[PDB]
Design a protein around this ligand. Structure first.
Ligand SMILES: *[C@@H]1O[C@H](CO)[C@@H](O[C@@H]2O[C@H](CO)[C@@H](O[C@@H]3O[C@H](CO)[C@@H](O)[C@H](O)[C@@H]3O)[C@H](O)[C@H]2NC(C)=O)[C@H](O)[C@H]1NC(C)=O
Ligand SMILES: *[C@@H]1O[C@H](CO)[C@@H](O[C@@H]2O[C@H](CO)[C@@H](O[C@@H]3O[C@H](CO)[C@@H](O)[C@H](O)[C@@H]3O)[C@H](O)[C@H]2NC(C)=O)[C@H](O)[C@H]1NC(C)=O
Ligand SMILES: *[C@@H]1O[C@H](CO)[C@@H](O[C@@H]2O[C@H](CO)[C@@H](O[C@@H]3O[C@H](CO)[C@@H](O)[C@H](O)[C@@H]3O)[C@H](O)[C@H]2NC(C)=O)[C@H](O)[C@H]1NC(C)=O
Ligand SMILES: *[C@@H]1O[C@H](CO)[C@@H](O[C@@H]2O[C@H](CO)[C@@H](O[C@@H]3O[C@H](CO)[C@@H](O)[C@H](O)[C@@H]3O)[C@H](O)[C@H]2NC(C)=O)[C@H](O)[C@H]1NC(C)=O
Ligand SMILES: *[C@@H]1O[C@H](CO)[C@@H](O[C@@H]2O[C@H](CO)[C@@H](O)[C@H](O)[C@H]2NC(C)=O)[C@H](O)[C@H]1NC(C)=O
Ligand SMILES: *[C@@H]1O[C@H](CO)[C@@H](O[C@@H]2O[C@H](CO)[C@@H](O)[C@H](O)[C@H]2NC(C)=O)[C@H](O)[C@H]1NC(C)=O
Ligand SMILES: *[C@@H]1O[C@H](CO)[C@@H](O[C@@H]2O[C@H](CO)[C@@H](O)[C@H](O)[C@H]2NC(C)=O)[C@H](O)[C@H]1NC(C)=O
Ligand SMILES: *[C@@H]1O[C@H](CO)[C@@H](O[C@@H]2O[C@H](CO)[C@@H](O)[C@H](O)[C@H]2NC(C)=O)[C@H](O)[C@H]1NC(C)=O
Ligand SMILES: *[C@@H]1O[C@H](CO)[C@@H](O)[C@H](O)[C@H]1NC(C)=O
Lengths: 140, 412, 200, 50, 38
């Protein structure tokens, strides 16, 4: 309404404002944030680690790396092959393969990581296997 | 001397709904308490490990929820598949087996269950490790296992058995002979199919059927909305927003008001985490019950009364649901009983004859031996009974002729 | 304090119904319709359950009935003589009484305030100071309530687990003949009978 | 080659005691913290949903 | 697996052959009859 100047959500956070000069209504989206998880094979095996940015798109992470915007000051080199989008978040330190295996170090949403020898060892990501297939020879 | 014995039976399928897991959350203690405030963070540092303890408690809960899901559903060593020919002795399992035409590959009942059950300041929600599709695959494997291999599925390799013979075993396991099933196989299959259709309609029609899972979703949504809502409180401060405190007050007064807001916000987080730990314990207990039910009701035939539904347990089928599991328990219910006159033993030539497997009954003129859970009179013979003692010690012994087959042959 | 929804008489009525079904039907009532059976035959099948033939019961029916009646009399004397037998239920009552006594005593605490009584704070201090002392007392009392509720939630979880065990035992040992070792007493299970008790 | 077999038996009756329910309580948060005090209740309102 | 001869001691009889959907034709060996005819 011409009267109202800003808006709030059901939990009383601010989600819209009226520009004081143009009277245009703008939505306010919180700036991207999330947890950071580090997948480590163990320091008695390898010093390579993978980093999961939880709850974000790999596009916003790439943009946040291009501009000096992302708060953590360390960077994981991106090779293209080591950037994989999961439902949990963006994993930028492991290669994704189409070979399923038993879950080792879980990531989430069906995706697990493990340290394996390359087709020379590296961290890989895969969709976890649930079990072997066995069609039962049922008959009358 | 009066005993009631069923002359008919009902195949009943009941629904048991159990929570297995709950929403996994994570909290950025600094962003929540001191969001985008350097001064607040510097005062927050004086509370030590408080954040670490809260983060650790929630991490432990998050891990526990995936453990609970794995324990309930990841009970199969192999992923079993049904045959392409869906003819299980005349029993129709189309409402419980995955429907290949649906991208989610859920059964009609699972699809119904999924359809009925319905970023904040420093708060996140973590996904489960096992996706809905993976849970559906475990449920499908469990159904294929039980349907095609019965009880052999859960205690070694799966061994195929014709479904009517699996049912014959299950009937024998409750004191009903195999011929009852085979003679009434069409009736039993029709009652099963009817019961499944009734369940589908019952769950569709009753909006409260899944309340046990909806309550978990609603309670966690309320906990998160309450925790966020607390950020607007003042706890005695001049304002709930830290930038107003720094703008209006001199540094040491701002520090006093900030400590006041910090205390209120950290108390809100401790309350949230404590409630989550209590709920996590409740969910774990539920998940442990669901895993026990899975092992004893689906991978076997439990003899525990009312554990796997009302009536004598025959079999059960899992179905997945959001944050939980739904079990369809198939039981045998006695019906249409008649009252017969009985006796503990038959007196023949001075010997006391007792049933080997059954109860002696009379229709008012003749004595027969019947199985206790289904009226089916048999001739009382020396093969069906055993002798112990004379016609004196047993109280209420009745005089009747016991037939001996060999003695009739001696006449031949 | 709120009363229970079911009265002691209603609980007694449920216990009586369960007992009448067990005595006159056996487990046929737990599984569906109640089918009458002579009690000695119900026992004969319970003997087959443990793995003893029917003729043992019938030849020793008088001995078995006498031992049963004696054992029940011994239970009545045991409960009468030993006051600690029911301590598990008394302890629940005692802990909740303690929790409420603790909760009310905390109202007298100052928590560092000038006085524990709000009316004294309001009568002795000008509002800008009274609000500080009152807020201190609010924090103390609110923390006391949070502590009470947390302890009640933990106790509630313990009671729920106990109630679930009691329901399982009634379903498996009253409405049936359990084969679980030591689930329902030492020895081979024959039968069980419920009795109502306060809060249990 | 030695087995012991019972020749007699005892029918024994034992007891098991289990809690089922506990005393139900209810607390008026405002009267407990701020009983019959308007100033306290008004301050209590600033703590939110507790 | 421990195959045994199908006999009248190892089985029981209920109903005729026209009810069971999967019933097959196979000789059941009676012990007493074999001695009596011999
Ligand atoms: C044992 O109980 C079952 C279930 O009650 C009995 O089967 C039922 O028998 C009745 C009468 O024959 C059936 O009713 C008929 O159904 C057809 C359906 O098209 C209808 O057109 C007829 O007018 C009549 O209503 C009933 O459907 C049937 N139920 C099932 C599940 O098959 C059975 O006969 C009983 N046996 C004994 C020995 O008591
Ligand atoms: C196993 O059971 C399912 C039902 O649980 C059977 O499928 C059902 O078959 C009937 C008759 O073929 C269908 O009824 C018809 O549906 C169409 C839908 O357009 C309607 O136009 C017709 O007037 C009639 O109502 C029913 O919808 C169908 N339901 C489902 C879910 O498929 C199935 O045939 C059974 N299989 C065996 C082998 O018995
Ligand atoms: C208790 O059960 C017995 C056994 O079923 C009942 O006796 C039997 O009754 C049937 C008729 O309902 C008799 O069948 C008929 O036998 C004559 C013989 O000539 C035959 O011509 C008929 O075509 C028919 O097959 C059967 O023989 C008879 N059995 C015996 C041993 O007498 C008895 O009536 C029942 N009593 C009560 C109170 O229910
Ligand atoms: C198995 O054990 C039971 C006891 O657990 C034996 O029954 C008991 O036998 C004794 C001696 O025969 C009875 O004692 C007598 O009782 C009468 C009561 O009037 C008394 O006048 C006698 O002077 C003597 O004290 C005892 O009461 C009896 N118990 C019961 C419950 O009947 C049974 O004989 C044993 N059987 C075997 C085969 O060992
Ligand atoms: C006062 O506010 C009005 C809008 O509420 C301003 O009007 C617009 O100013 C921009 C300046 O680039 C123009 O492009 C728009 O066309 C103006 N609006 C209209 C309807 O013409 C106005 O300029 C503001 N004045 C001051 C001094 O700030
Ligand atoms: C088991 O037997 C059933 C018949 O009772 C078979 O199903 C029939 O299959 C034929 C084709 O060969 C169809 O024309 C019939 O309509 C089917 N009947 C029913 C009731 O579905 C079934 O295929 C047999 N199973 C196997 C593995 O051979
Ligand atoms: C069962 O049959 C026996 C004999 O076959 C009956 O025994 C008789 O019992 C009475 C009881 O007073 C005696 O007076 C007779 O002398 C007994 N006769 C014989 C031959 O022993 C027995 O009573 C019968 N039981 C029933 C219930 O009828
Ligand atoms: C089992 O044996 C019976 C005979 O004892 C068979 O029944 C006969 O089957 C033939 C088949 O052409 C018919 O012409 C006869 O009329 C039937 N007689 C009777 C009395 O039913 C039966 O088919 C055999 N079953 C199998 C599976 O071989
Ligand atoms: C990531 O962003 C791109 C932007 O085009 C979008 O198409 C894609 O679906 C997004 N992925 C996720 C997982 O949000």
């Amino acid at each position: 309404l011409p009267f109202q100047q800003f808006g709030r959500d059901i939990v009383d956070t601010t989600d819209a404002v009226r520009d004081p000069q143009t009277l245009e209504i703008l939505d306010i989206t919180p700036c991207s944030f999330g947890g950071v998880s580090v997948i480590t094979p163990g320091t008695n095996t390898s010093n390579q680690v993978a980093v999961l940015y939880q709850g974000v798109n790999c596009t916003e992470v790439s943009v946040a790396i291009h501009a000096d915007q992302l708060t953590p000051t360390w960077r994981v080199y991106s090779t293209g092959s080591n950037v994989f989008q999961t439902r949990a978040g963006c994993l930028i330190g492991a290669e994704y393969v189409n070979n399923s295996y038993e879950c080792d170090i879980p990531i989430g949403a069906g995706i697990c990581a493990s340290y394996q020898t390359q087709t020379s060892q590296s961290i890989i990501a895969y969709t976890m296997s649930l079990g072997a297939e066995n069609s039962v020879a049922y008959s009358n | 001397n009066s005993i009631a014995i069923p002359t008919n039976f009902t195949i009943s399928v009941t629904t048991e709904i159990l929570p297995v897991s709950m929403t996994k959350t994570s909290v950025d203690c600094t962003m929540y308490i001191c969001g985008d405030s350097t001064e607040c963070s510097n005062l927050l540092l004086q509370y030590g490990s408080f954040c670490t303890q809260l983060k650790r408690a929630l991490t432990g809960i998050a891990v526990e929820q995936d453990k609970n899901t794995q324990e309930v559903f990841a009970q199969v060593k192999q992923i079993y598949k049904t045959p392409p020919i869906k003819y299980f002795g005349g029993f129709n399992f189309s409402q419980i087996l995955p429907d290949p035409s649906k991208p989610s590959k859920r059964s009609p009942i699972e699809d119904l269950l999924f359809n009925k059950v319905t970023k904040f300041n420093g708060l996140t929600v973590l996904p489960p490790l096992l996706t809905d599709e993976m849970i559906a695959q475990y449920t499908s494997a469990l159904l294929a296992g039980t349907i095609t291999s019965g009880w052999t599925f859960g205690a070694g390799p799966a061994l195929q058995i014709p479904f009517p013979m699996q049912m014959a075993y299950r009937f024998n396991g409750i004191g009903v002979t195999q011929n009852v099933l085979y003679e009434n196989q069409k009736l039993i299959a029709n009652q099963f199919n009817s019961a499944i259709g009734k369940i589908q309609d019952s769950l569709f029609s009753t909006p409260s059927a899944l309340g046990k899972l909806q309550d978990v979703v609603n309670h966690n949504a309320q906990a998160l909305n309450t925790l966020v809502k607390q950020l607007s409180s003042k706890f005695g401060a001049i304002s709930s927003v830290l930038n107003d405190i720094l703008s209006r007050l001199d540094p040491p007064e701002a520090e006093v008001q900030i400590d006041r807001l910090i205390t209120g916000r950290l108390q809100s987080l401790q309350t949230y985490v404590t409630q989550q730990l209590i709920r996590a314990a409740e969910i774990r207990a539920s998940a442990n019950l669901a895993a026990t039910k899975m092992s004893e009701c689906v991978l076997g035939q439990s003899k525990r009364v009312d554990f796997c539904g009302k009536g004598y347990h025959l079999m059960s089928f899992p179905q997945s649901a959001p944050h939980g599991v739904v079990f369809l328990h198939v039981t045998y219910v006695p019906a249409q009983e008649k009252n017969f006159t009985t006796a503990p033993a038959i007196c023949h030539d001075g010997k006391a004859h007792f049933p080997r497997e059954g109860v002696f009954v009379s229709n008012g003129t003749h004595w027969f031996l019947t199985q206790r859970n289904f009226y089916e009179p048999q001739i009382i013979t020396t093969d069906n009974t055993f002798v112990s003692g004379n016609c004196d010690v047993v109280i209420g012994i009745v005089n009747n002729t016991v037939y001996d087959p060999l003695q009739l042959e001696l006449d031949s």
